Each structure stands twice: as C-alpha cells, then as structure tokens.
Amino acid sequence: GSDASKLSSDYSLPDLINTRKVPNNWQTGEQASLEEGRIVLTSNQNSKGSLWLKQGFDLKDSFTMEWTFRSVGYSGQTDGGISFWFVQDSNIPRDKQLYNGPVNYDGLQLLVDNNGPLGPTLRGQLNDGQKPVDKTKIYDQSFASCLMGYQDSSVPSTIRVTYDLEDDNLLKVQVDNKVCFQTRKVRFPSGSYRIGVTAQNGAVNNNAESFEIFKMQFFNGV
C-alpha cells in the first residue's frame, strides 16, 4: 500500500492547497494555470491545458501514481475529457492531438470522459508509438474500463494506478480505493517515461467544464 516512506518527491505534485507557484519539477502548458489551491486545466469555454513532469521517470521497478482531480461547472455529455499519461518519450510529448496530449503515444492513456456509449467512464488505452490511434474507435479500443461519475462535483476523485512487477506485471487502476480494472496483459518495457495530465472541454453547448488538479503522488512499490 502507499506509505509516506515510499513517496518519490521528485515525481510528485504536493497538495496545492496553499501553493503559490507551480512546483519547479512540473511544467504547465497551453492554458493550464495555478489558481487558488489547484491547477485548472480548462479555465474557459473551449480551452486546453497540460501539466507534465519536467524529468523523465526511468522504469525499472514497481510504482504507484495517485491523481487527485475534479470536474466542476458543467453537467452534460460533451466531447471534452481529461487524460492521464504514462508514455515513453525523451521530452515532454510534443503532440497535442488527443485530449491535448499525444495521439501517437507509446505507453498508457487513462481517459475520463462521458462521450462514449457507456456514459461517464474511466478507460485504459494502449499504443506503441508507431501510428496515431484512430479517435473514431477509441471506445471500442479501450483495453479495460469502468463506469465512473465525475462531472459537477467539488469533491475530488482519486485515481490510483499501480504497476506491480512482484505480482506478475499487474496493472491496476482504483477509483476512490475501489478497483476499476486490472490486467497482467501489459508488460511495459524499460525506458524513460513521461507522466502528466491533459484536458480539453471542447465547444459542446458552449460548456465551461473545469478539469482541476489538486495533488499527485508517486510512490515506489504498490
């Protein structure tokens, strides 16, 4: 389980509640901005924002990523969404075509959105960097998913991603401590991985859905 003794400060975003400047190990992009106690990714109608670690993570052993986020200000189906990334690249990924993150990624995308056939979901997506994914097939191409309500609540959700080399490469996602999905079919190769979060709210109904980050914690182990 997560324990303070296993926390990796270098890959964490300490609770932003009283933070006045974005921590120096992270970089905002597009229109993402630190506001009172949180980083707002989509601060106005049809906006985009990114938040990535400046340094890569060298994958050698088990790890945990916990994201604390919320969506406020809009209820209704939109073509917006928020994506959490774990992808191999030598820099912060340049491409912005998939929820303001890379469409030709090599690694894992976790997408929270409500535009697919099951309504609000958390979905896992994989790509190997050879081709852009087909956005028109994303819901059929999820390797795993769960229902997850997220819109229009000021109480943030916690997505906990664990990758356990000491349990035959178990990749698991929990939401608020409840399992969303797990699999042993993904054996990530070694290299330098980029970790970040991106979001867009699009133009449906001139919505102003606000995707917001409170905290992210990275641990060695699970």
Query: Which helix H or strand E contains 124, and what residues bound it?
Result: strand 121-128
SS3 6: helix
Token pair 């769960």: residue: 146
Domains of the chain in sequence order: 1-222 (2.60.120.200)
How far apart CA 150 and CA 153 sit, in angstroms, is: 7
Show the tokens assigned to 17. Answer: 């509640």
Amino acid at 150: Y
- CB-neighbour burial class of residue 58 (10 A; exposed 0-12, middle 13-18, buried 19+): exposed
Instruction: Determine contact, residues 108/126, Cβ cutoff 8 Å.
Output: yes
How far apart CA 102 and CA 128 sit, in angstroms, is: 12
Q: What is the resolution of this structure in A?
A: 1.0
SS3 5: helix
- Experimental approach was X-ray
Instruction: Determine contact, residues 174/181, Cβ cutoff 8 Å.
Output: no
172-204: b (≥16 Cβ within 10 Å) or e: bbbbeeeebbeeeeeebeeeebbbbbbbbbbee
